[PDB]
Amino acid sequence: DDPLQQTGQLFGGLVRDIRRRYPYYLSDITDAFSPQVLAAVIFIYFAALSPAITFGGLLGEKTRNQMGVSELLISTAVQGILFALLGAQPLLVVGFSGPLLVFEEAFFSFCETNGLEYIVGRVWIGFWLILLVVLVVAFEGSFLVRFISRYTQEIFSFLISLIFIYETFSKLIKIFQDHPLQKTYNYNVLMVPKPQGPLPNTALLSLVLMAGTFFFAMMLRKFKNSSYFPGKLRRVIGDFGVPISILIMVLVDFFIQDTYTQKLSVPDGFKVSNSSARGWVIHPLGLRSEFPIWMMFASALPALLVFILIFLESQITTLIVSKPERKMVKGSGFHLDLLLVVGMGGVAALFGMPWLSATTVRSVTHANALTVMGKAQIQEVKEQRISGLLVAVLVGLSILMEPILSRIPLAVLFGIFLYMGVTSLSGIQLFDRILLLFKPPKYHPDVPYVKRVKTWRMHLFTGIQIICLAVLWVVKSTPASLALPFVLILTVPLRRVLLPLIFRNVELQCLDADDA
Amino acid sequence: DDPLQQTGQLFGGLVRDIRRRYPYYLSDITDAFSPQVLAAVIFIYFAALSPAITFGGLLGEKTRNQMGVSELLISTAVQGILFALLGAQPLLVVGFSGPLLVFEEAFFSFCETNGLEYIVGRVWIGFWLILLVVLVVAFEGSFLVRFISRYTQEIFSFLISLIFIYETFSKLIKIFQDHPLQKTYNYNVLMVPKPQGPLPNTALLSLVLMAGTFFFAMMLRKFKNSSYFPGKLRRVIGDFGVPISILIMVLVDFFIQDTYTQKLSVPDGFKVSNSSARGWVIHPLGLRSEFPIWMMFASALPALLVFILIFLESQITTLIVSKPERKMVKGSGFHLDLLLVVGMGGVAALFGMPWLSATTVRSVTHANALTVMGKAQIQEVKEQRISGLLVAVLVGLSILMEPILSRIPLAVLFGIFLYMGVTSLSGIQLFDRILLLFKPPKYHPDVPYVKRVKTWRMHLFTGIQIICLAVLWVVKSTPASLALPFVLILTVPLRRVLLPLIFRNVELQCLDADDA
Ligand SMILES: CCCCCCCCCCCCCCCCCC(=O)OC[C@H](COP(=O)([O-])OCC[N+](C)(C)C)OC(=O)CCCCCCCCCCCCCCCCC
Ligand SMILES: CCCCCCCCCCCCCCCCCC(=O)OC[C@H](COP(=O)([O-])OCC[N+](C)(C)C)OC(=O)CCCCCCCCCCCCCCCCC
Ligand SMILES: OCCN(CCO)c1nc(N2CCCCC2)c2nc(N(CCO)CCO)nc(N3CCCCC3)c2n1
Ligand SMILES: OCCN(CCO)c1nc(N2CCCCC2)c2nc(N(CCO)CCO)nc(N3CCCCC3)c2n1
Ligand SMILES: *[C@@H]1O[C@H](CO)[C@@H](O[C@H]2O[C@H](CO)[C@@H](O)[C@H](O)[C@H]2NC(C)=O)[C@H](O)[C@H]1NC(C)=O
Ligand SMILES: *[C@@H]1O[C@H](CO)[C@@H](O[C@H]2O[C@H](CO)[C@@H](O)[C@H](O)[C@H]2NC(C)=O)[C@H](O)[C@H]1NC(C)=O
Ligand SMILES: CC(C)CCC[C@@H](C)[C@H]1CC[C@H]2[C@@H]3CC=C4C[C@@H](O)CC[C@]4(C)[C@H]3CC[C@]12C
Ligand SMILES: CC(C)CCC[C@@H](C)[C@H]1CC[C@H]2[C@@H]3CC=C4C[C@@H](O)CC[C@]4(C)[C@H]3CC[C@]12C
Ligand SMILES: CC(C)CCC[C@@H](C)[C@H]1CC[C@H]2[C@@H]3CC=C4C[C@@H](O)CC[C@]4(C)[C@H]3CC[C@]12C
Ligand SMILES: CC(C)CCC[C@@H](C)[C@H]1CC[C@H]2[C@@H]3CC=C4C[C@@H](O)CC[C@]4(C)[C@H]3CC[C@]12C
Ligand SMILES: CC(C)CCC[C@@H](C)[C@H]1CC[C@H]2[C@@H]3CC=C4C[C@@H](O)CC[C@]4(C)[C@H]3CC[C@]12C
Ligand SMILES: CC(C)CCC[C@@H](C)[C@H]1CC[C@H]2[C@@H]3CC=C4C[C@@H](O)CC[C@]4(C)[C@H]3CC[C@]12C
Ligand SMILES: CC(C)CCC[C@@H](C)[C@H]1CC[C@H]2[C@@H]3CC=C4C[C@@H](O)CC[C@]4(C)[C@H]3CC[C@]12C
Ligand SMILES: CC(C)CCC[C@@H](C)[C@H]1CC[C@H]2[C@@H]3CC=C4C[C@@H](O)CC[C@]4(C)[C@H]3CC[C@]12C
């Protein structure tokens, strides 16, 4: 029954993953028939879209429009639809991530330096990723995911959410730096690409919209598990907590018409950003210049790095989402998801669209959205394919529904990112122990490790995980950001060889447990 | 032991009030030796000052400077010092109120029409208030305060808090109306009296400062009764919850130097606002024109109205502050406080300074500030004279402490008013029953009246008190605002004659109880 086992035959895990979930496929359609599911579709849409808009914008300027917002949106749409329809864990949101953007920057700079075609280079990376993932899934390489314990899962899960929170505030600060609070402003300024100068009331309204959206979302989450209004109405309003918070604060900005706020800009149509550069289908052998055969084979070495990026990102996200404490009964497959995510991404490279990964926050957020609360204990989770499908389709149709997206500020969706960032920390025992450092020892949650492990030893354990978080954040800050996944890999040796020396088994078993 | 009893002798209550509290007078100095007491001094200072600044400003413009901020500040200082040193309940904050402001415009408008000297008119009102209060205290007229039950106390206490909250938002709205969020602004504008035109970033920053101060104050109140940090540090930070919230958000505005925010303006020195109109000491017989002897006797009729205003305001505030549920052991005197408050106010009229009253929110706020929490049950209250004395002295020295006050925005102190407004509702059973209207019947607090009175009957009782609140708010809105105290008087007949018909004794006794 345990997914992470070596069968001892070629593609044994892949078959066993299909065999376990596809029996539930008719349930994966009906279970979606709930208002809570529709509230998740609306929430996770904006959670899924705005990153693809942002990263696409960032790719555009750092890759000279070889790959822009349109390519990313279509990729997130097509791979999102397929993965929802064919995957093992539909609650995983497949999209673009920060470590993937860093690779594209380095790959572009590498290609620029050596003087090779970037987009043609990726096609080969994509082919080697298809070769590697088939070779990995063949021998059931996802068995090594067993070794990654809560220690490494939580260190990861915490770091990703901090980033998500950090970046959100970095955008608010950027708005304030762009539109400073001056004494006088210049009004003879163009706003056709974007505002050339500073603008009045822009930065403060952006803060008001961000703070307000995070407030309303949190207060409606507080309202969900309150004792006000009838139980039906309290849940319905609580389930649609974010969509109400968005609608309100979007309508707030709609009425404030004279003042400027930065909105969600999408491409005009379904066309590549730079048409002169590349077409919709990228040629392996080359576009303009004849692509070298040395790079055609040496594409293996970056593809190995991209595989490790997509593997760890996706497989650790699968762990986090399919934890025992989260009441997920339909079953999670680590081989079929890895095969699709990388396999699709490899074929996506052929059409000059970016390979994606099962992103942690968006996956967690989508799981948390579909998770229902009893009495605070988790009753069940609405595990189905319709939520992940509809989000992907809506992301695909984002280019068409510009009229609607044009009235939605970025400030409000940054308020939603802050809500996603804070909410992501909820079921992380690391974060729980970070709070206990500040709380006195008498006022502890009396959890198994609190009762058994000594207070100073528990804090010492928590201390070492901050040292790891700190080191990971330093590695992230430095140019060597593609080394970050390999530093997180060292978190597994730590718990395996280093901690057993300074700590005891009894404490280690209590602090780091598979189930709680 | 019960204060509200007829002794059956002249000035029996006054003697009995002195006899009960003055034995504790040495305790009323030492009990003030606590950090929590110093945190109250800082909090209640701004709570006491900014109203005198505002009402003084309002008197100034509606009385042609015959009485402005200077007179009000000195009155609140002198009467505040004396009442703290000589009073029965030092926790009562004596200051100017809205119903008193209504009388001063009404009396000025009367004097302007008939063509009489306003300030000389008040001197006679003051003499008749001294005659009435001595005649009332003689026969122990504060025995009628017994008839005022939680019903009328809570209806009052709630209405006063709603006003306090309403007015706060009316000032924010005014700022937004004054400094609208436009596309373009004019920078060639004078700001020497105040900004002549609209200004950028002023209204939104004012909202940010107000929202931020109310947030920090509430989160530090939430922190006070949390389980974070050692018990000493949690209380100390919790007790200084408002002063920290003020300091922070004042320093926030200090760093935002280019943008404009409206600050606390006080007079330059200790001089009357309009020297030409009149001097410090007002002459009974007249200043310029010979004051009529018909008004010298007819001054009784407005003085009777002012007495009823100051009596009900102060005596109902004394009830609220000296409730049984609030752990106040040193004893409350309703005769000695009424004698001082009105008697001082009558003598204050002679120097052209405004008669004051024991204001409900500022009294409640000051009591709530000095109230310590155990475990949520009230352990004790730090009842002493030093808090009320120091506030009054600081209000007196506000005119000299201009450099510090000039850097403090109004926006932040409006955030403190909102905090005072919401916190004032805490120990009001009316407000508690307003929440139970929305909550389901199964999730009720299990208080005596919840289990004894039927849910539909309790909601019917609460419904009638909203009808009263509504009627009182309508009477307040209309020109007849001096009729409001006499409408609140009718709240006592209601519970006495009208409710016993539709309701039963058992329910009435449970819903309206002297102790809980
Ligand atoms: C869940 C409820 C939480 C939200 C409820 C709302 C509470 C707060 C309401 C808004 C007020 C924010 C307080 C800070 C005020 C700063 C004012 C300002 O803009 O100053 C100018 C400053 C700029 O300072 P400056 O003027 O020195 O900049 C330099 C300018 N030159 C170069 C010209 C010298 O801007 C900022 O503050 C930017 C940084 C943002 C910091 C505030 C972000 C917080 C908002 C989201 C809330 C998240 C925390 C909540 C806690 C977690 C809860 C789970
Ligand atoms: C304890 C924490 C609670 C406080 C922090 C939570 C608040 C989050 C911070 C942001 C403020 C909220 C967003 C308000 C939306 C309006 C913003 C704006 O632009 O206004 C434009 C409007 C003006 O709109 P306008 O300018 O478009 O109107 C048109 C005018 N013409 C046509 C002339 C151009 O501003 C106002 O009217 C002010 C409204 C303020 C209302 C919000 C009050 C916030 C203060 C705290 C309230 C506490 C509530 C909870 C109490 C209970 C506590 C448990
Ligand atoms: O852009 C839209 C989303 N956001 C906004 C969040 O509010 C965002 N911006 C980032 N940017 C900073 C740097 C490069 C430009 C944008 C960024 N960078 C990184 N990293 C790469 C840098 O090494 C860190 C390693 O994961 N990781 C991010 N998360 C995304 C999900 C899975 C991974 C963690 C991330 N997220
Ligand atoms: O934090 C806000 C406090 N302020 C700011 C001024 O210091 C304020 N402003 C008022 N107004 C401003 C705008 C023009 C009118 C005055 C006002 N008006 C009334 N009343 C209605 C006038 O008829 C009387 C109703 O009983 N009562 C008030 N209270 C305060 C004392 C205890 C009692 C209730 C009151 N308070
Ligand atoms: C589309 O791609 C082409 C080819 O990469 C870009 O072409 C030229 O301009 C760039 C600067 O804008 C230079 O860095 C290139 O060297 C130059 N290349 C050639 C062959 O002329 C073009 O700018 C891109 N267009 C957009 C809209 O991004
Ligand atoms: C001080 O008081 C005097 C007397 O009331 C005010 O005097 C004059 O100006 C007023 C308008 O500003 C008129 O309404 C008065 O009728 C007029 N009275 C006389 C006798 O000339 C004076 O304005 C006040 N000054 C200030 C600073 O408020
Ligand atoms: C699903 C698609 C898009 C992924 C592409 C990867 C290919 C190579 C994968 C997907 C499904 C896989 C097959 C699934 C099941 C079996 C049955 C087993 O007895 C032998 C291997 C075999 C036949 C696998 C071979 C490899 C396979 C064909
Ligand atoms: C586009 C941006 C600005 C906001 C989008 C949010 C929209 C889609 C949200 C906000 C509030 C939502 C509604 C709130 C509650 C209910 C009751 C439920 O039983 C059926 C759906 C229904 C009727 C929702 C439909 C979707 C809804 C209208
Ligand atoms: C419709 C649902 C099921 C899928 C959502 C995504 C849809 C809208 C997207 C994904 C890929 C997109 C296509 C990608 C490529 C092209 C070629 C171009 O010359 C015309 C548009 C066209 C044909 C696009 C139309 C819209 C499209 C089909
Ligand atoms: C450079 C720093 C920030 C990175 C390392 C994280 C810091 C905060 C960690 C490392 C070791 C930790 C300490 C280890 C042991 C104890 C003893 C316990 O009774 C109280 C907490 C305390 C004192 C911990 C507090 C947090 C701590 C100081
Ligand atoms: C503070 C002053 C100026 C207020 C003036 C009010 C007058 C009427 C008050 C103030 C003090 C009062 C006296 C205080 C003490 C006593 C002793 C008692 O056994 C008989 C009544 C008697 C004699 C009181 C009578 C009324 C009294 C004289
Ligand atoms: C005038 C404006 C800026 C607000 C002024 C508030 C000042 C007076 C407040 C803010 C925070 C306060 C401090 C906070 C905590 C303590 C610790 C306590 O054991 C003694 C008092 C002391 C040291 C307070 C002194 C007064 C203080 C500095
Ligand atoms: C000092 C403490 C105990 C009391 C606080 C209030 C003080 C500062 C106030 C209240 C009344 C004020 C006085 C009122 C009247 C005048 C007359 C004027 O021509 C000079 C200033 C002078 C003399 C004031 C000085 C300051 C004063 C004494
Ligand atoms: C002038 C305005 C404020 C008047 C409205 C006040 C509201 C709150 C009052 C007026 C009439 C009241 C209702 C009258 C009758 C009933 C039926 C009873 O079985 C439960 C309470 C309930 C439902 C009351 C609830 C409160 C109520 C709705």
Side-chain angles (χ1 to χ4, degrees), chain A residues 1-324 326-516, chain B residues 1-324 326-516:
Chain A
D1 68 323
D2 52 339
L4 309 166
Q5 284 299 130
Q6 290 185 312
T7 308
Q9 63 189 48
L10 277 283
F11 305 91
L14 178 63
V15 169
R16 200 158 300 285
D17 288 8
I18 294 159
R19 296 301 295 282
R20 159 176 65 244
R21 186 61 185 249
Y22 273 61
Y24 296 100
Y25 200 96
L26 198 72
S27 305
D28 295 352
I29 303 140
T30 60
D31 296 0
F33 306 158
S34 178
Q36 187 169 341
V37 168
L38 195 143
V41 168
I42 301 293
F43 171 31
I44 299 295
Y45 168 56
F46 294 117
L49 170 64
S50 181
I53 299 301
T54 310
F55 285 126
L58 294 168
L59 278 160
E61 72 194 52
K62 298 165 192 176
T63 323
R64 302 191 288 92
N65 290 300
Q66 289 196 44
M67 215 167 48
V69 185
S70 59
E71 287 95 331
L72 187 34
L73 283 187
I74 288 184
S75 180
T76 309
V78 169
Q79 297 182 230
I81 288 158
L82 287 170
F83 184 85
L85 288 163
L86 302 174
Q89 185 66 248
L91 266 59
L92 294 186
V93 174
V94 183
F96 207 67
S97 59
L100 288 175
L101 174 75
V102 174
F103 170 76
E104 306 304 335
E105 303 166 9
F107 194 65
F108 182 75
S109 69
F110 185 81
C111 291
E112 284 286 309
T113 303
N114 293 116
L116 309 176
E117 300 196 319
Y118 161 84
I119 201 74
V120 180
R122 281 174 36 77
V123 171
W124 295 113
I125 304 306
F127 282 131
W128 276 92
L129 277 164
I130 294 157
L131 184 73
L132 281 165
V133 72
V134 167
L135 188 142
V136 160
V137 167
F139 315 143
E140 309 172 292
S142 312
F143 80 102
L144 295 162
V145 174
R146 258 179 60 255
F147 284 43
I148 311 155
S149 71
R150 216 187 272 260
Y151 199 77
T152 311
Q153 291 164 46
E154 290 197 333
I155 283 162
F156 184 68
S157 188
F158 196 75
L159 175 60
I160 299 300
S161 41
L162 287 187
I163 292 155
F164 210 80
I165 297 155
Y166 169 76
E167 293 300 332
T168 298
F169 285 119
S170 310
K171 324 207 217 182
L172 174 63
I173 291 161
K174 190 59 167 60
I175 287 166
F176 268 102
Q177 282 185 240
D178 289 323
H179 304 279
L181 277 66
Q182 311 191 136
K183 188 160 174 278
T184 184
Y185 294 79
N186 185 33
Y187 298 116
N188 301 354
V189 288
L190 281 297
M191 294 156 69
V192 199
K194 64 153 200 172
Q196 299 298 314
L199 284 172
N201 313 352
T202 300
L204 285 171
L205 185 57
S206 296
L207 170 61
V208 160
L209 284 165
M210 186 180 304
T213 305
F214 180 63
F215 169 74
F216 270 113
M218 279 292 188
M219 288 295 136
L220 281 165
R221 182 147 85 78
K222 184 171 289 189
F223 178 63
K224 186 176 41 173
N225 62 334
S226 77
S227 62
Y228 288 89
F229 288 87
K232 184 182 174 60
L233 192 70
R234 198 196 311 111
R235 166 153 35 255
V236 165
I237 296 288
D239 293 337
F240 287 87
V242 171
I244 290 281
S245 303
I246 295 160
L247 183 70
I248 287 162
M249 299 298 295
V250 165
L251 283 165
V252 163
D253 196 63
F254 179 70
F255 304 140
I256 309 159
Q257 64 195 4
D258 290 319
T259 314
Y260 172 77
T261 50
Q262 194 179 344
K263 306 289 174 59
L264 286 162
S265 186
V266 303
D268 65 323
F270 295 98
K271 299 298 286 175
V272 299
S273 47
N274 198 350
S275 188
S276 61
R278 62 181 291 279
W280 266 127
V281 185
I282 310 298
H283 291 101
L285 298 170
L287 293 169
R288 294 157 177 276
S289 58
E290 189 63 24
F291 191 83
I293 302 182
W294 76 259
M295 192 68 179
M296 188 175 302
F297 274 94
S299 46
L301 288 92
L304 192 64
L305 202 141
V306 171
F307 185 77
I308 292 158
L309 277 167
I310 292 158
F311 183 91
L312 290 164
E313 175 55 65
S314 304
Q315 294 286 67
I316 301 164
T317 296
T318 312
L319 285 167
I320 291 157
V321 163
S322 70
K323 258 178 161 69
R326 292 159 159 281
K327 305 309 192 304
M328 297 221 186
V329 308
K330 307 290 262 290
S332 190
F334 293 83
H335 302 94
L336 176 61
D337 288 353
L338 179 66
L339 181 135
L340 286 159
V341 163
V342 176
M344 284 186 312
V347 177
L350 213 164
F351 296 94
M353 266 101 74
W355 46 69
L356 313 168
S357 56
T359 49
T360 318
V361 170
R362 281 168 267 181
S363 296
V364 161
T365 303
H366 183 212
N368 290 359
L370 296 165
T371 303
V372 318
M373 297 301 307
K375 188 195 292 291
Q377 289 290 120
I378 309 303
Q379 182 191 319
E380 75 178 314
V381 178
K382 297 221 172 294
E383 302 169 82
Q384 34 65 50
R385 291 165 187 280
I386 306 302
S387 306
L389 192 145
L390 285 171
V391 163
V393 175
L394 284 162
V395 164
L397 295 164
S398 289
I399 294 155
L400 289 163
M401 62 183 77
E402 173 265 337
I404 302 157
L405 295 174
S406 66
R407 320 280 206 214
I408 311 171
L410 291 174
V412 298
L413 260 66
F414 297 161
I416 296 302
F417 292 152
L418 189 61
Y419 170 83
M420 287 163 61
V422 173
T423 305
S424 178
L425 299 157
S426 60
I428 309 183
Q429 295 187 13
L430 176 51
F431 172 60
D432 293 354
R433 286 191 303 281
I434 305 312
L435 299 180
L436 294 212
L437 278 163
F438 302 112
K439 298 180 78 190
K442 72 184 303 308
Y443 297 107
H444 273 354
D446 206 10
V447 279
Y449 42 97
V450 155
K451 187 181 181 62
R452 300 181 65 92
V453 189
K454 298 190 195 183
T455 307
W456 85 268
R457 298 217 52 108
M458 157 184 315
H459 291 330
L460 172 62
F461 190 83
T462 319
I464 298 154
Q465 288 177 291
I466 297 281
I467 291 280
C468 292
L469 275 162
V471 169
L472 284 159
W473 195 279
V474 162
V475 167
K476 181 166 63 76
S477 297
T478 51
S481 292
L482 293 170
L484 179 98
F486 298 90
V487 169
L488 180 73
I489 285 286
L490 260 301
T491 310
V492 189
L494 169 50
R495 177 62 181 89
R496 273 190 140 73
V497 317
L498 295 174
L499 295 190
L501 299 178
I502 199 168
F503 273 91
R504 302 182 287 284
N505 176 238
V506 169
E507 293 178 352
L508 292 174
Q509 289 298 300
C510 295
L511 293 155
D512 187 355
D514 62 317
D515 65 323
Chain B
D1 68 323
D2 52 339
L4 309 166
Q5 284 299 130
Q6 290 185 312
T7 308
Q9 63 189 48
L10 277 283
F11 305 91
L14 178 63
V15 169
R16 200 158 300 285
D17 288 8
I18 294 158
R19 296 301 295 281
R20 159 176 65 244
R21 186 61 185 249
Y22 273 61
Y24 296 100
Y25 200 96
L26 198 72
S27 305
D28 295 352
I29 303 139
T30 60
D31 296 0
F33 307 158
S34 292
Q36 187 169 341
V37 168
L38 195 143
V41 169
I42 301 289
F43 172 31
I44 299 295
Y45 168 56
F46 293 117
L49 170 64
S50 181
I53 299 301
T54 311
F55 286 134
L58 293 167
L59 279 163
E61 72 194 52
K62 297 173 191 301
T63 322
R64 302 186 302 107
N65 283 308
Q66 289 196 39
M67 202 174 55
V69 186
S70 313
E71 293 93 333
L72 188 33
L73 281 189
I74 288 183
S75 179
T76 309
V78 169
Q79 297 182 230
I81 288 159
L82 287 170
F83 184 85
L85 288 163
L86 302 174
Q89 185 66 248
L91 266 59
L92 294 186
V93 175
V94 182
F96 207 67
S97 58
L100 289 175
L101 178 67
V102 171
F103 179 81
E104 295 283 44
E105 54 190 282
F107 193 66
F108 178 81
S109 64
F110 184 81
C111 291
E112 283 286 309
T113 303
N114 293 116
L116 309 176
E117 299 196 319
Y118 161 84
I119 201 75
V120 180
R122 281 174 36 77
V123 171
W124 295 113
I125 303 306
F127 282 131
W128 276 92
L129 277 164
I130 294 157
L131 184 73
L132 281 165
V133 72
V134 168
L135 187 142
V136 160
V137 167
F139 315 143
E140 309 172 292
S142 313
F143 80 101
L144 295 162
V145 174
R146 258 178 60 255
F147 284 44
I148 312 155
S149 69
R150 187 178 293 276
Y151 199 76
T152 310
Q153 291 165 46
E154 291 196 333
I155 283 162
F156 184 69
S157 188
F158 196 76
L159 175 60
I160 300 304
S161 313
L162 284 174
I163 292 155
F164 210 80
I165 297 155
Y166 169 76
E167 294 300 333
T168 298
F169 285 119
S170 310
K171 324 207 217 182
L172 173 63
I173 291 161
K174 190 59 167 60
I175 287 166
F176 268 102
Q177 282 185 240
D178 289 323
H179 304 279
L181 277 66
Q182 311 191 136
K183 188 160 173 278
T184 184
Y185 294 79
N186 185 34
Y187 298 116
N188 301 354
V189 288
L190 281 297
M191 294 156 69
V192 199
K194 64 153 200 172
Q196 299 298 314
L199 284 172
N201 313 352
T202 300
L204 285 171
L205 185 57
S206 296
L207 170 61
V208 159
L209 284 165
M210 186 181 304
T213 305
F214 180 64
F215 168 74
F216 270 113
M218 279 292 188
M219 288 295 136
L220 281 166
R221 182 147 85 78
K222 184 172 289 189
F223 178 63
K224 186 176 41 173
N225 62 334
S226 77
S227 62
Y228 287 91
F229 288 87
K232 183 198 170 59
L233 192 70
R234 198 196 311 111
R235 166 153 35 255
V236 164
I237 296 288
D239 293 337
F240 287 87
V242 171
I244 290 281
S245 303
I246 295 160
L247 183 71
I248 287 162
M249 299 298 295
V250 165
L251 283 165
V252 163
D253 196 63
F254 179 70
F255 304 141
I256 309 159
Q257 284 171 346
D258 290 318
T259 314
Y260 172 77
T261 50
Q262 194 179 344
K263 306 289 174 59
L264 286 162
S265 186
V266 303
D268 65 323
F270 295 98
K271 298 298 286 175
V272 299
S273 47
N274 196 2
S275 183
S276 65
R278 49 88 158 190
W280 286 106
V281 185
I282 311 299
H283 291 101
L285 298 170
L287 293 168
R288 291 177 188 176
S289 58
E290 189 63 24
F291 191 83
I293 302 182
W294 76 259
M295 192 68 179
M296 188 175 302
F297 274 94
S299 46
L301 292 182
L304 192 64
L305 202 141
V306 171
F307 185 77
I308 292 158
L309 277 167
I310 292 158
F311 183 91
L312 290 164
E313 175 55 64
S314 304
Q315 294 285 255
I316 301 163
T317 296
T318 312
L319 286 167
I320 291 157
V321 163
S322 70
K323 258 177 161 68
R326 292 159 159 281
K327 305 309 192 304
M328 297 221 185
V329 308
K330 307 290 262 290
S332 190
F334 293 83
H335 302 94
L336 176 61
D337 288 353
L338 179 67
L339 182 136
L340 286 159
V341 163
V342 176
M344 284 186 312
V347 176
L350 213 164
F351 296 94
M353 266 101 74
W355 46 69
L356 313 168
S357 57
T359 49
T360 318
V361 170
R362 281 168 267 181
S363 296
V364 161
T365 303
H366 183 212
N368 290 359
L370 296 165
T371 303
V372 318
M373 297 301 308
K375 188 196 292 291
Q377 289 290 120
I378 309 303
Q379 182 191 319
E380 75 178 315
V381 178
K382 297 220 172 294
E383 302 169 82
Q384 34 64 50
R385 291 165 187 280
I386 306 302
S387 306
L389 192 145
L390 285 171
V391 163
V393 175
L394 284 162
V395 164
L397 295 164
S398 289
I399 294 155
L400 301 177
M401 44 191 61
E402 185 265 348
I404 323 173
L405 267 49
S406 58
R407 271 70 178 278
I408 307 162
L410 291 174
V412 298
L413 260 66
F414 297 161
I416 296 302
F417 292 151
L418 189 61
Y419 170 83
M420 287 163 61
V422 174
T423 305
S424 178
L425 299 157
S426 60
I428 309 183
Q429 295 186 15
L430 175 51
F431 172 60
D432 294 354
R433 286 191 303 281
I434 305 312
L435 299 180
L436 297 209
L437 279 163
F438 302 112
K439 298 180 78 190
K442 72 185 303 308
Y443 297 107
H444 272 204
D446 215 46
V447 282
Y449 51 90
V450 146
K451 312 164 299 186
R452 292 181 176 163
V453 190
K454 319 214 304 186
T455 308
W456 92 264
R457 302 285 289 170
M458 177 178 70
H459 292 329
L460 164 68
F461 190 83
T462 319
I464 297 154
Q465 288 177 291
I466 298 280
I467 291 280
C468 292
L469 275 162
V471 169
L472 284 159
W473 195 279
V474 163
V475 167
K476 181 165 65 75
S477 297
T478 51
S481 175
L482 292 171
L484 179 98
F486 298 90
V487 169
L488 180 74
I489 285 286
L490 260 301
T491 310
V492 189
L494 168 51
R495 177 62 181 89
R496 273 190 140 73
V497 317
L498 295 174
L499 295 190
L501 300 178
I502 199 168
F503 273 92
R504 302 181 286 284
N505 176 238
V506 169
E507 293 179 352
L508 292 174
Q509 289 298 300
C510 294
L511 292 155
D512 187 355
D514 62 317
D515 65 323

